[PDB]
Amino acid sequence: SGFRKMAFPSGKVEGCMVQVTCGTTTLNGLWLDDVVYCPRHVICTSEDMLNPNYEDLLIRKSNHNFLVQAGNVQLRVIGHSMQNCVLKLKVDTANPKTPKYKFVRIQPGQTFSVLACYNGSPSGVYQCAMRPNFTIKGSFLNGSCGSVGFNIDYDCVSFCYMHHMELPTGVHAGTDLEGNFYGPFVDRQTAQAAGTDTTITVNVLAWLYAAVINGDRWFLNRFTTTLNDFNLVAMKYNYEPLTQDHVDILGPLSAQTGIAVLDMCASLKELLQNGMNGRTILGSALLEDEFTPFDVVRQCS
Amino acid sequence: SGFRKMAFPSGKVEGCMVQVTCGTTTLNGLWLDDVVYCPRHVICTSEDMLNPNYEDLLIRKSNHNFLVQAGNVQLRVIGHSMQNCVLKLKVDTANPKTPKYKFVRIQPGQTFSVLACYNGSPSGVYQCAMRPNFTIKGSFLNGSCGSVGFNIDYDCVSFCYMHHMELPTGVHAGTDLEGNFYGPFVDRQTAQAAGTDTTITVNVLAWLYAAVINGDRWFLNRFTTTLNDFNLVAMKYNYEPLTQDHVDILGPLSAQTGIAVLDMCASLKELLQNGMNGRTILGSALLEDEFTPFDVVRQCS
Ligand SMILES: *[C@H](S)C(=O)c1cccc(C(=O)N[C@@H](Cc2ccccc2)C(=O)OC)c1
Numbered sequence: 218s219g220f221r222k223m224a225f226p227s228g229k230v231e232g233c234m235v236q237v238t239c240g241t242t243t244l245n246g247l248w249l250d251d252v253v254y255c256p257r258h259v260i261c262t263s264e265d266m267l268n269p270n271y272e273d274l275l276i277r278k279s280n281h282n283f284l285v286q287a288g289n290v291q292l293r294v295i296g297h298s299m300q301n302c303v304l305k306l307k308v309d310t311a312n313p314k315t316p317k318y319k320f321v322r323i324q325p326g327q328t329f330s331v332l333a334c335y336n337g338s339p340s341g342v343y344q345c346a347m348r349p350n351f352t353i354k355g356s357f358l359n360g361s362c363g364s365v366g367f368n369i370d371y372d373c374v375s376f377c378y379m380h381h382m383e384l385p386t387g388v389h390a391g392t393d394l395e396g397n398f399y400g401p402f403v404d405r406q407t408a409q410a411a412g413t414d415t416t417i418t419v420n421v422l423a424w425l426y427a428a429v430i431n432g433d434r435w436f437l438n439r440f441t442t443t444l445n446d447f448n449l450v451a452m453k454y455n456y457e458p459l460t461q462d463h464v465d466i467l468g469p470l471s472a473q474t475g476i477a478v479l480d481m482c483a484s485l486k487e488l489l490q491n492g493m494n495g496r497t498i499l500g501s502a503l504l505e506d507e508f509t510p511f512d513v514v515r516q517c518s
Numbered sequence: 519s520g521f522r523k524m525a526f527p528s529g530k531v532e533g534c535m536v537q538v539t540c541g542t543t544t545l546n547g548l549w550l551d552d553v554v555y556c557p558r559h560v561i562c563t564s565e566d567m568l569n570p571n572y573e574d575l576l577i578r579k580s581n582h583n584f585l586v587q588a589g590n591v592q593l594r595v596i597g598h599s600m601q602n603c604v605l606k607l608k609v610d611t612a613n614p615k616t617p618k619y620k621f622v623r624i625q626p627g628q629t630f631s632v633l634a635c636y637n638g639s640p641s642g643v644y645q646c647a648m649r650p651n652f653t654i655k656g657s658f659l660n661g662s663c664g665s666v667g668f669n670i671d672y673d674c675v676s677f678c679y680m681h682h683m684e685l686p687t688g689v690h691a692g693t694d695l696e697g698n699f700y701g702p703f704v705d706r707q708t709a710q711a712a713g714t715d716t717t718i719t720v721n722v723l724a725w726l727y728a729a730v731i732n733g734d735r736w737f738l739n740r741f742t743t744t745l746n747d748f749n750l751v752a753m754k755y756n757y758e759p760l761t762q763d764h765v766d767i768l769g770p771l772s773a774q775t776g777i778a779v780l781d782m783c784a785s786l787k788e789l790l791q792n793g794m795n796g797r798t799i800l801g802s803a804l805l806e807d808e809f810t811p812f813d814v815v816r817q818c819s
């Protein structure tokens with residue numbers, strides 16, 4: 218019993234984190250096989266961040282300008298190249314702790330674990346969701362860029378995020394491991410801002426199923442709704458539309474609890490229109506949208 | 519920026535988890551140096567749980583009755599003994615991955631990370647607080663006992679909790695690593711239940727300081743209160759009394775934000791008496807009490 222925001226065990230990732238320094242900028246990197254991946258912003262100067270041409274900045278660097286430290290061991294850089302907004306530093310030692318891994322780009326509404334690191338040293342692990350507006354609500358301080366996000370399946374680490382920056386509202390933006398940004402953000406100084414966001418409906422329904430599995434039933438009712446009538450309500454409250462694929466994905470949890478998906482949608486409509494009237498669900502007084510159907514099944518089996 | 523429930527990186531702990539089997543009962547154990555620690559309930563049968571005499575049950579066992587598996591490698595048990603409610607299995611191999619460690623008993627109101635495991639395999643990591651009533655609000659399924667809780671300082675793992683059971687309200691009980699239970703709970707079948715709980719006031723104030731550090735200020739006011747008048751309000755709302763030691767511990771966060779502790783207590787009094795009026799703090803619509811002053815300082819530096 219119980220339901221917590223649970224991250225994947227981080228050991229496999231911890232054995233990949235290193236420190237990368239170029240001039241006076243120090244950040245984190247990810248060491249897999251004989252390559253270290255890190256944000257290309259490591260090569261910038263403070264006065265470069267105004268429309269830096271990164272191809273020019275990199276051509277002016279050599280291998281010896283990159284100091285890579287893994288624990289207390291310096292790794293010799295023997296090649297460098299850029300891929301989109303990430304730097305690839307070839308080193309002369311393959312990481313003996315490389316896990317099986319994949320680089321996978323995630324979708325908005327999917328969750329992942331973040332290993333926050335400073336100076337190549339892991340500090341904390343937590344779960345995050347990619348928001349519909351392609352930001353994440355992380356916890357990151359100066360020095361955390363290059364920290365990565367990941368999911369683990371069997372023994373395979375699927376890396377999905379590399380941290381780059383903080384936007385003015387305090388939310389975070391970064392790229393995939395191929396160096397392509399999530400969202401309409403860039404690694405330079407502009408007035409860029411998070412766009413409007415929405416609530417991830419299918420995840421809210423998944424979490425209501427978690428609550429039922431864990432004994433919270435007060436919000437249930439005998440009603441059902443149609444998908445169309447539900448989505449009229451969703452649109453009014455800035456919730457994403459619910460698709461038949463979403464309904465299908467909720468199939469297992471509906472079968473486990475015996476509560477039809479459209480039946481649970483009637484409960485969600487009531488909660489949106491009426492609020493909670495002083496009650497809580499799974500220890501929250503708000504509707505939670507950062508757990509996917511998979512997250513619920515994994516934790517509530 | 520940002521504020522998340524953050525756990526410690528779990529790799530050091532992961533390298534200590536093993537599977538312990540006795541007869542048909544399988545659970546997790548913690549392998550440090552040449553000893554494996556696990557709940558003594560592993561030696562019980564289903565019909566033993568009615569007032570089992572564990573000294574009799576253990577005398578009837580031999581080393582070969584314990585199967586310890588670390589990954590895919592069986593460890594030979596060469597001695598067994600009981601310490602309070604934990605079993606100590608001496609094995610013929612020292613764990614090469616033993617971290618520096620300590621066994622430390624925590625107090626109610628302190629937090630720790632839990633590495634939930636099944637069949638000696640880590641599944642997830644999350645943060646928990648020891649409640650005033652000595653339970654924890656975990657997330658644990660059948661097979662998770664022997665999973666441990668811990669804090670990490672520098673390179674030293676301080677183990678503080680070993681999971682044993684779930685109480686009827688869905689909250690969890692266990693022991694320290696010396697096998698002594700937290701709270702008035704026992705490892706046998708009874709009608710035992712969690713006692714009345716309270717809210718951890720000093721942690722709520724720590725979290726209000728985190729919110730201010732992160733830009734949430736709407737709950738601030740120009741008022742102050744005395745400690746006595748505040749504690750009259752705390753008692754009414756089932757909050758723990760605030761001591762001068764608590765005030766002292768909040769000293770750094772008060773200095774960082776410029777908000778006196780008693781000043782913040784006036785805000786908390788207003789929130790308790792008036793509620794939130796539709797607003798949120800750090801993404802919550804309830805007052806959060808599972809972050810200690812130390813947790814805030816570590817994450818909000
Ligand atoms: C480090 S988390 C990183 O990868 C990164 C990516 C994009 C932008 C920034 C960043 O902080 N830029 C600042 C300017 C700067 C910082 C450090 C060295 C040189 C220049 C900035 O002004 O935006 C916040 C970091």
Ligand SMILES: *[C@H](S)C(=O)c1cccc(C(=O)N[C@@H](Cc2ccccc2)C(=O)OC)c1
Nearest residue numbers: 543557559562563564567662663682683705
């Ligand atoms: C496993 S998490 C463990 O250590 C433990 C400690 C105390 C009590 C129990 C427990 O589940 N007892 C049940 C009976 C039982 C289970 C398994 C084998 C033998 C007997 C019980 O009835 O209480 C929930 C487990």
